[PDB]
Amino acid sequence: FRKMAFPSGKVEGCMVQVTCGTTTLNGLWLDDVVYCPRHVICTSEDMLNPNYEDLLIRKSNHNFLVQAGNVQLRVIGHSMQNCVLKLKVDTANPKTPKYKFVRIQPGQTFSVLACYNGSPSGVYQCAMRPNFTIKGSFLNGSCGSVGFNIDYDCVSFCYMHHMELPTGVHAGTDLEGNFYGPFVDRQTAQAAGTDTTITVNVLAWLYAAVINGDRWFLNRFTTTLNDFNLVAMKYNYEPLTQDHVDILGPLSAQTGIAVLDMCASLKELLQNGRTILGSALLEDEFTPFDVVRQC
Amino acid sequence: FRKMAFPSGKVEGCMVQVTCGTTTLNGLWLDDVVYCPRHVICTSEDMLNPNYEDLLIRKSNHNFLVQAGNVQLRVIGHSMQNCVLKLKVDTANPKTPKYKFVRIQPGQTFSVLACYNGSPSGVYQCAMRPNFTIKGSFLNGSCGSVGFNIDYDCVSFCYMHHMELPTGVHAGTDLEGNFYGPFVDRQTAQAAGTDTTITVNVLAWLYAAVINGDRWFLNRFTTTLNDFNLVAMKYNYEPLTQDHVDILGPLSAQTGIAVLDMCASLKELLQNGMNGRTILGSALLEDEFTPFDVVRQCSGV
Numbered sequence A: 001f002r003k004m005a006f007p008s009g010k011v012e013g014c015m016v017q018v019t020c021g022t023t024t025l026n027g028l029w030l031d032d033v034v035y036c037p038r039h040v041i042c043t044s045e046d047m048l049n050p051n052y053e054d055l056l057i058r059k060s061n062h063n064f065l066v067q068a069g070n071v072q073l074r075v076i077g078h079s080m081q082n083c084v085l086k087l088k089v090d091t092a093n094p095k096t097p098k099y100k101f102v103r104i105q106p107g108q109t110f111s112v113l114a115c116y117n118g119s120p121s122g123v124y125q126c127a128m129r130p131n132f133t134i135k136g137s138f139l140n141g142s143c144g145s146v147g148f149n150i151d152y153d154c155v156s157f158c159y160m161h162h163m164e165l166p167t168g169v170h171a172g173t174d175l176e177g178n179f180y181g182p183f184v185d186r187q188t189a190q191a192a193g194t195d196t197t198i199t200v201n202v203l204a205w206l207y208a209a210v211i212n213g214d215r216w217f218l219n220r221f222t223t224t225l226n227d228f229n230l231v232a233m234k235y236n237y238e239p240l241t242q243d244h245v246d247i248l249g250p251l252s253a254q255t256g257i258a259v260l261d262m263c264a265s266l267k268e269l270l271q272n273g274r275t276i277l278g279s280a281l282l283e284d285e286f287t288p289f290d291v292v293r294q295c
Numbered sequence B: 001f002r003k004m005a006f007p008s009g010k011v012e013g014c015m016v017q018v019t020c021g022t023t024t025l026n027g028l029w030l031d032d033v034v035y036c037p038r039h040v041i042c043t044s045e046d047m048l049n050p051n052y053e054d055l056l057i058r059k060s061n062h063n064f065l066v067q068a069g070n071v072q073l074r075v076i077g078h079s080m081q082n083c084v085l086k087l088k089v090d091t092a093n094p095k096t097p098k099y100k101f102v103r104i105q106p107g108q109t110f111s112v113l114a115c116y117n118g119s120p121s122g123v124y125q126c127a128m129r130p131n132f133t134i135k136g137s138f139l140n141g142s143c144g145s146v147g148f149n150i151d152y153d154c155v156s157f158c159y160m161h162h163m164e165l166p167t168g169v170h171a172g173t174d175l176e177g178n179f180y181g182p183f184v185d186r187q188t189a190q191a192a193g194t195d196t197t198i199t200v201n202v203l204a205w206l207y208a209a210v211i212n213g214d215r216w217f218l219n220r221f222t223t224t225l226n227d228f229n230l231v232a233m234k235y236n237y238e239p240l241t242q243d244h245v246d247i248l249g250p251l252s253a254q255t256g257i258a259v260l261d262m263c264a265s266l267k268e269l270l271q272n273g274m275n276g277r278t279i280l281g282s283a284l285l286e287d288e289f290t291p292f293d294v295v296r297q298c299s300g301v
């Protein structure tokens, strides 16, 4: 059992290089539109507190250089939607997949195709935290990298990268330019809330382990929802609902471990602390969906 | 800092489905050849101890169903090379990347494109353990999935998946059909040796942590290759050579922390544990990043 990204070929086809002044970053070319963070129009000074409306007024279509390999695309329109720029280009991406824009929920996962200069460097899987940050690997030039899931041949884009916070975690927008969490695209110190642990994911992981041999944490003891949720309240785990139980229903079936048998194992691991799938810590960034896909 | 696979696009376009009998697995289609594990030609009873020569003799081209997307590729020939089967096909993959076949060294890493029925489902990063196994995620039907690196525009194919060992680790071959390690493609309990921890990679990871702000484990001490190696041997860490030191040179230069200083820090961590702290978020020492891995990621190649 491994943390696993989606095959990223479908997204690589959409990545382009967008340049404006001395600023360059990555764009998402879908049909005849390139999506990219709006702070591409910003200079050094401007970054501390830009007026994007006024700054955009100062830029014409020709100030934007969209590059797809050894091919320049002509920009012919531009519009600001929230924190993203939509540049209309004269050419439609032949490699446009079937795609949709979604806004995922915290606790959901997606893959990230980290890019630089419109070229992909690597791929990894992230979770959206309850405080609407992600733990990534992004350097300067990586803005415009996107997060996505693949259901069938449909690419669901859900994230576009804009910034690092002083803690070193990351923040960005959906593809309509709306930030996840309270953040603004300005170079100021910004706090994320206190985080918490995605209980439903820890359970699915404990299922993943069982399915893959690790079984030492199981026990004869059992527990109720209301009982488990006092323990969880104390260790800063999200409370478990009947909706979460039902979500875990399918892994319960494959294993014959009732959800609340597994919650008993988790109460005990929480109160008393070997390894589980070779981790010394409880992993909370696999969803039930992820666990079922990989088993 | 993250465990990060190469982008897999160039490889997805080479994955096909190969079926022979009730047995389906994945093949790698490059130019006009499809490469896959040879046990695709086995049934149930054959698995326990097959004579692959005899079994391949009794099979013909029409016995191999190769599907690529929604297109059926006509097989027009079949040879065996070591533990892999080469199926010549009527059409050449128009999506054949520039590629090479390499046999990687233990301690080196590579990306795995996990596939089922010729369809990619996922991608992750692995190391060739010193005992020539890999800790992967492989189910039935995943055989023929490949591991690879990208250097330049060239895909270097280094691994093709064959089997799971009793302990749960995985074993396979290079793309010429030679297994990494002492393993055979037969349904029998098979031992890998005792595994060791890849010391030069652990050091590479400690550099990655310093680069990313995690510094509590640095100390003012230093050591010698010889004095460190006597500790390494005790905790089943590969011994460090002057070659490993020079490989770590570039990361030494960027952090201005001397290799043997970091070895002093590793020494302390092994003898004292992590005292409850973490490092790059981990409660254990990671050994599946090469120095090359850390540099590619901490500089954006």
Ligand SMILES: *C(=O)[C@H](C[C@@H]1CCNC1=O)NC(=O)[C@H](CC(C)C)NC(=O)OC[C@@H]1C[C@H]1c1ccccc1
Residues within 6 Å of the ligand: A025, A039, A047, A138, A139, A140, A141, A142, A143, A144, A161, A162, A163, A164, A165, A166, A170, A184, A185, A186, A187, A188, A189, A190
């Ligand atoms: C993409 O253009 C880039 C990616 C950043 C680069 C460093 N790591 C990353 O993920 N984005 C930016 O540089 C941001 C542009 C603004 C928001 C329009 N700015 C940014 O990320 O600044 C880094 C964090 C804010 C600074 C900070 C730390 C500690 C105390 C105060 C401020």
Ligand SMILES: *C(=O)[C@H](C[C@@H]1CCNC1=O)NC(=O)[C@H](CC(C)C)NC(=O)OC[C@@H]1C[C@H]1c1ccccc1
Residues within 6 Å of the ligand: B025, B039, B042, B047, B138, B139, B140, B141, B142, B143, B144, B161, B162, B163, B164, B165, B166, B170, B184, B185, B186, B187, B188, B189, B190
């Ligand atoms: C790919 O077709 C498949 C992938 C395996 C299946 C389960 N997990 C995997 O990675 N390969 C095979 O099934 C192998 C074909 C043989 C070599 C002809 N066989 C295999 O993987 O056996 C599973 C483990 C070895 C058996 C075992 C355990 C304990 C004691 C004795 C034997």
